[PDB]
Design a protein around this nucleic acid. Structure first.
Lengths: 133, 176, 77, 257, 168, 140
RNA sequence: CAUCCGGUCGAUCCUGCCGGAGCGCGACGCUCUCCCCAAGGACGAAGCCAUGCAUGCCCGCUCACCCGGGACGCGGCGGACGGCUCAGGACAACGGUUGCACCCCCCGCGGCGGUCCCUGCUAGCCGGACACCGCUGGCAACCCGGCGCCAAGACGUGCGCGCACGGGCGCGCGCCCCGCGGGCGAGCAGCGUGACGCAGCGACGGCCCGCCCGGGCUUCCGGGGCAUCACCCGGUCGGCGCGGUCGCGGCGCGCCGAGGGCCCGACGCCUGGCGGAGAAUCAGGGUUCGACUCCGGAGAGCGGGCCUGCGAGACGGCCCGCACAUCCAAGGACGGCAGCAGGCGCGGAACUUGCCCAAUGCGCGGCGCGCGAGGCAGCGACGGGGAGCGCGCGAGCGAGGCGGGCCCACAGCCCCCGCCGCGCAGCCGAGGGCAAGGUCUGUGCCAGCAGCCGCGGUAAUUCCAGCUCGGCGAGCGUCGCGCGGCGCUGCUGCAGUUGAAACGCCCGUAGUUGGCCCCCCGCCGCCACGAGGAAACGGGAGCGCUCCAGGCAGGCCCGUUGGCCC
């Protein structure tokens, strides 16, 4: 991730199954946890766009990816979030792209629109995404 | 592509179905000793062609005498054998072709025609002399011992014009 | 079918490995004009036509009836 | 399959051209024109191989690159331009004139002819077309394109000078006729009979001069003079020499050799 | 990718056929150019489409007017062309006003009104000539040829067709 | 039995041959396709392999000897072959898990001689033919 | 193109299969003296690719250049042909046979050749409008910008005869039918008659027509296995009205019915399924195989979708989806060796990042270049063929070497010359089948041998050695497979009492088989005879490559040949 992020409403808590934008052969990613989360008692870890999330590929996914906690990045979220320019933005579906611990993406292509916050955090996401909105 | 593929080749030598028959094997050694043959492959080529020619006469046998095909093929088959000097000139019939043996093919050898001309007085010396090309068929020097001289060229076969007997230059030990 | 009949074409196929003939049948589709009144078991004389439909490249030019049903008897007409 | 082929392999080439199997992957290919591909021979072979005038295929193109050869009285120079049946081909540098004829075996032969023979050309009449704005027209075996009392199959003696109808050889029983296609090409005989069958492929029966009734398809029949050859016939008169008569000729040739 | 290739069709025995080739250009098909009646003319855009062998076809897509002929008197004149009445294959196409050969149409009687003065020239076309619209069917392929000529309906087709559409 | 011989019985004769031609064990092995799928040497004269272990097999009686052999895992099908190394003392030439080419004993998938369960035999070890090693024509 | 022998027993005769015996064609081991000829990364990976190359040719204009030497761009033609490989595809492809009165087709060849205008014309023949090129510039690269200017046998416009004319029209033969043409086997044509359109080509006449060369389809017959697949299909099957196409058609659409297939095996499924020409093996009949030469198909990582063109649903075009990549300055860019070498993966297995268009063609235009097509060399025991390792009393080379001659795109190799002259063998066996020791060593059911039967247990004809001898031969052994063997697949031509095997019995539908009998034709089938439809290939005529495997050559010539059959 690059630079200092800005707090944005964190739509996805743990347990949030999110569709997979990348063509790596995963269809739906199950969020085990959020990278960088010191949390208070009882608070489910929550993540927004541009946040790295440990996910597990579901039964529908190709077997090689399945059964390993893997890192991913949230690229779209249904929850409306306010940009510091007063733009309240939301997406049709919550989505994630599977990425190595370094930043490289496991899938060659990212499908559909991608949020600016993810695009700024990850340079590879910015180049791959056809549309950053 | 590559007309080298278009060029053709044929199997001229047939091995015995029965490989080890002591009576046939010894007779082949006699033929090899008497006619100065190099290996039993040499004999096989002659045996194959004796068979095919006799088979052609047998094919002509099932044709009526003077059948357009029978007359055309019959004339040609007889012609080639007496042209080479293998079959009796006067007979010119299919039945006489049926009696031909590999001895006739052996007699056509240039190295064979020399021992009858007394040039080398040994099939093994004739073979040796042909290798050094000291025998010429009518203006053609021959390095190969199976020239298969046609009947007319028996008069032509003689010691080579190149240094040998009645020498053009110095031949062999006189040279060396 | 309306304005269409199926013409069974009986024929023999010679086998050379065994010198016997095996009986075959080929059905052909023929467009029939109302001028032809056609009943099953009759014998028709078909002719070639530019394809009228998916299975019809043949038209009827003459129809010959037979009394009742003359059995079948595999006749390569 | 994509577009038109512009090559002809040596094995693909018709047998009549007699191009050697080895020494060449592919024979030359004719151009679309007066004669068809298997109904015509290449001009390059007629000079380069048949006459041996051109040492290489390219040096046959050189000979006609500068005008030096003519077909049917017209320069018609292209090297692979089709040269087919009854063609007046003349080499004026050699001062020789040759009708392209069919040999009894069936191959094409260049036979020397008189200047009077060069004066006229023989071509079969194809079916009359009614096109070109209703003006009646009819095509030839050489595709050249009238006289009302004429039918198909008859041979017109086009002059190549007038470029007009001259003596029309009507197709009827008893005319001395040549066979263009089939196994007995080159043989000359009067047509004994014709059986149409009112369908297609009219049968042709031909009595030869020696009484052997040879036969062919009615399309492959060429008229050669309504009465008399009316052409320079190569010295075989379509007698059909037999395989043994051919062995006699060959063996006397070897005797002379 | 439209094609009329038979490979994509099943056999007489209802059997799937193995696809031995990808779609080929020769068996290609092109979008149906639906000729559209302009209705009030207060535009005739006719397209031209490259064909096989560098040939040409004219595709009518919107047009009004066109040559018509009164077969009974054998007089032929251009006509304005009014709404399509009847399509014989669809009731929607008539309302849409797409033009295709076999579609019966109304035409203005004003060019052919010159025969009202004449008498005993049939009776049916006499009443249509008196009326604003004449019953007529199209005889030209508007889409392929690019023109939509037609014949004024006369006698039996007119008898059957009038019964088919006009009465309520 | 009349062996159906009528002028119109030519489908019956053909049908009988195709069904009863499968009875022959040799035609069955050749054209069933079962050998091809199950053959360690599937349509191959020979194959490369690693020696699983060097284990002698006791010969079938009457003959009594320990015929030194090597179990071999094939690179192509990962199947284990028991291959008899031939001649005298040639097992020593082989080391465990050495490259080995193995060819069938010559009975077309059948065991040859007293060796029990030996559909194949070793021809080459680590690039050198065992006879060449045996005669010392080519050393290891 | 007609052949067996070894193996069940104490012996015998059988059945029965095992093993030998020959051939082909790939691996594999050991060895090869040459010369000639020659296959060559198909074989469950149509897997992936670094590098270089595989389609250019000309000027139609030339204002630069600089003497027509003539680039650079536009312009024309070709890049669809050619090379590659069999992935797919089982009433399909492919082959013979048909049809287009259901059609499309550049070049070329042989012809026709009135092109309305209101007009508007410059028609002694016209416009504007750009590349190139300057002039300033971007970009890491790729790739292009703007400016300014000028061309074309480029393109746009444009007179031009009312048998003007592309198209598409409406209308023009008939009397039961069947017999003349411009016709045909057949109402097909080509127009006259009344409209519409204003198509081409026209700024160096082609509009157009035919022939033809290919296609596009189409007819008929042939066209894998499986019943542990018996019931299938639902635009599927007919008809009708449109579209759409080059065109016919459920080819798409509406509409209307109820079909179409099948124990004469449908449908479904599978295939380490290209098909035929052909190949291998062989008395006859069969069997087996169809990567590659020739032809036809089909594809160019995978699906689609396309414009250009006369023709491609093109991939050495483009566009997109899907993989898998490369360049990178991180912004972006840019792929495709089932072309040729060469790399890699894999497999037991398969060649040089080699040289030239001179032939053999083809592309481009009358004046010569382009081609990893093709040729030529290199590797090359796939294999085929020809000679060697002696001979002589002392006769003599060729294998080589070195200069020539000559060959060759140049080399080379061969051969011919002169000189110098270096002959030079292996690989399996001897108990039998099956050819060749009633010899000495070792060893002692060990080691080993042995396709098969068998040998080895301290005197082995069978092992390890020596010795001899045999068989083949610059080849010999080994493994896999096909064929023969094997009449052990049986149509010819097998068996079922007891060696394997008559359903326990009976009716029975398909299926198959049906006494005689009519002479005299009609359809059958059948048989003969034609006709027409590529060769190579198999055979075969003719022919001295020095002989040969070869090749269609050759020779003081059939009209020199190259027939003729398949």
């Amino acid at each position: 991730g690059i630079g200092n992020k800005f707090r944005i409403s964190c739509g996805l808590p743990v347990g949030a199954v999110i569709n997979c934008a990348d063509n790596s052969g995963a269809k739906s990613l199950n969020m085990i946890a959020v990278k960088n989360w010191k949390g208070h008692l009882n608070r489910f870890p929550k993540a927004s766009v541009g946040d790295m999330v440990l996910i597990t590929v579901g039964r529908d996914g190709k077997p090689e990816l399945r059964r390993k906690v893997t890192p991913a990045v949230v690229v779209r979220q249904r929850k409306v979030w306010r940009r510091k320019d007063g733009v309240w933005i939301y997406f049709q579906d919550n989505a994630g792209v599977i990425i190595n611990p370094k930043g490289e993406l496991k899938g060659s292509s990212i499908t559909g629109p991608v949020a600016k916050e993810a695009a700024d955090r990850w340079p590879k996401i910015s180049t791959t995404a056809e549309c950053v909105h | 592509p590559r007309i080298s593929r278009h060029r053709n080749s044929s199997k001229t030598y047939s091995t015995p179905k029965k490989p080890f028959t002591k009576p046939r094997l010894d007779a082949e050694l006699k033929l090899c000793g008497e006619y100065g043959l190099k290996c039993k492959r040499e004999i096989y080529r002659a045996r194959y062609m004796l068979a095919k020619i006799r088979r052609t006469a047998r094919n002509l046998l099932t044709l009526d005498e003077n059948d357009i095909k029978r007359r055309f093929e019959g004339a040609a088959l007889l012609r080639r054998l007496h042209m080479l000097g293998i079959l009796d000139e006067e007979k010119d019939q299919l039945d006489y072709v049926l009696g031909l043996r590999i001895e006739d093919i052996f007699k056509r050898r240039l190295q064979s025609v020399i021992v009858e001309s007394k040039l080398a007085k040994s099939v093994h010396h004739a073979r040796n002399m042909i290798k050094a090309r000291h025998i010429s068929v009518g203006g053609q020097i021959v390095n190969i011992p199976s020239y298969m001289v046609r009947i007319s060229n028996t008069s032509r076969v003689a010691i080579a014009d190149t240094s040998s007997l009645a020498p053009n230059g110095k031949p062999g030990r006189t040279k060396r | 079918m309306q304005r269409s009949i199926i013409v069974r074409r009986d024929y023999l196929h010679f086998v050379q490995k065994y010198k016997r003939y095996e009986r075959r049948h080929k059905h052909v589709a023929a467009h029939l004009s109302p001028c032809f009144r056609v009943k099953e078991g009759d014998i028709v004389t078909i002719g070639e036509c530019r394809p009228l439909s998916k299975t019809i490249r043949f038209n009827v030019i003459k129809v010959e009836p037979v009394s009742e049903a003359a059995k079948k008897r595999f006749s390569p007409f | 399959a994509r577009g038109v082929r512009k090559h002809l392999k040596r094995l693909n080439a018709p047998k009549h051209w007699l191009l050697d199997k080895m020494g060449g992957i592919w024979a030359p290919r004719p151009t679309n024109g007066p004669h068809g591909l298997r109904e015509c021979i290449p001009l390059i072979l007629i000079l380069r191989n048949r006459l041996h005038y051109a040492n290489t295929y390219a040096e046959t193109s050189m000979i006609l690159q500068d005008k030096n050869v003519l077909i049917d009285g017209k320069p018609r120079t292209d090297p692979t331009f089709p040269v087919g049946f009854m063609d007046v081909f003349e080499i004026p540098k050699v001062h020789k004139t040759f009708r392209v004829l069919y040999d009894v075996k069936g191959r094409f032969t260049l036979v020397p002819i008189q200047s009077n023979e060069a004066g006229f050309k023989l071509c079969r009449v194809q079916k009359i077309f009614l096109g070109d704005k209703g003006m009646p027209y009819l095509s030839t075996h050489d595709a050249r394109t009238p006289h009302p009392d004429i039918k198909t199959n008859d041979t017109i003696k086009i002059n190549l000078k007038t470029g007009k109808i001259d003596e029309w050889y009507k197709f009827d029983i008893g005319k001395i006729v040549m066979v263009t296609g089939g196994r007995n090409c080159g043989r000359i005989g009067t047509i004994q009979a014709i059986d149409k069958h009112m369908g297609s492929y009219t049968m042709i029966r031909m009595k030869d001069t020696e009484g052997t009734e040879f036969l062919t398809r009615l399309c492959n029949v060429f008229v050669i003079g309504n009465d008399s050859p009316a052409v320079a016939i190569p010295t075989t008169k379509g007698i059909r020499p037999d395989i043994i008569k051919n062995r006699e000729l060959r063996l006397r040739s070897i005797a002379k050799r | 990718g439209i094609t009329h290739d038979k490979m994509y069709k099943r056999s007489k025995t209802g059997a799937v056929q193995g696809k031995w080739h990808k779609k080929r250009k020769y068996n290609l098909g092109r979008q149906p150019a639906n000729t559209k009646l302009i209705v009030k003319v207060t535009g005739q855009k006719i397209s031209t489409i490259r064909c096989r062998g560098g040939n040409i076809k004219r595709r009518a897509l919107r047009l009004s007017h066109g040559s018509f002929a009164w077969g009974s008197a054998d007089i032929s004149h251009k006509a304005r062309i009014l709404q399509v009445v009847y399509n014989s294959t669809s009731n929607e196409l008539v309302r849409t006003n797409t033009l295709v050969k076999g579609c019966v149409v109304q035409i203005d009687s004003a060019p052919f009104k010159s025969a009202l003065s004449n008498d005993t020239l049939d009776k049916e076309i006499l009443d249509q000539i008196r009326g604003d619209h004449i019953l007529a069917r199209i005889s030209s392929r508007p889409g392929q040829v690019g023109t939509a000529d037609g014949y004024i309906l006369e006698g039996p087709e007119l008898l059957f067709y009038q019964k088919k559409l006009a009465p309520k | 039995s009349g062996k159906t011989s009528g002028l119109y019985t030519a489908r019956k004769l053909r049908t009988i041959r195709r069904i009863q031609r499968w009875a022959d064990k040799r035609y069955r092995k050749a054209h069933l396709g079962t050998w091809l799928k199950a053959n360690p040497l599937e349509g191959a004269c020979m194959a490369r392999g690693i020696v699983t272990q060097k284990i002698g097999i006791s010969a079938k009686q009457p003959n009594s000897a320990v015929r030194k052999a090597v179990r071999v895992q094939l690179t192509k099908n990962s199947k284990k072959i028991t291959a008899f190394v031939p001649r005298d003392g040639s097992l020593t030439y082989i080391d465990n898990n050495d490259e080995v080419l193995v060819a069938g004993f010559g009975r077309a998938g059948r065991a040859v001689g007293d060796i029990p369960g030996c559909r194949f035999k070793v021809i080459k070890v680590a690039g050198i033919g065992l006879l060449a090693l045996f005669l010392r024509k080519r050393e290891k």
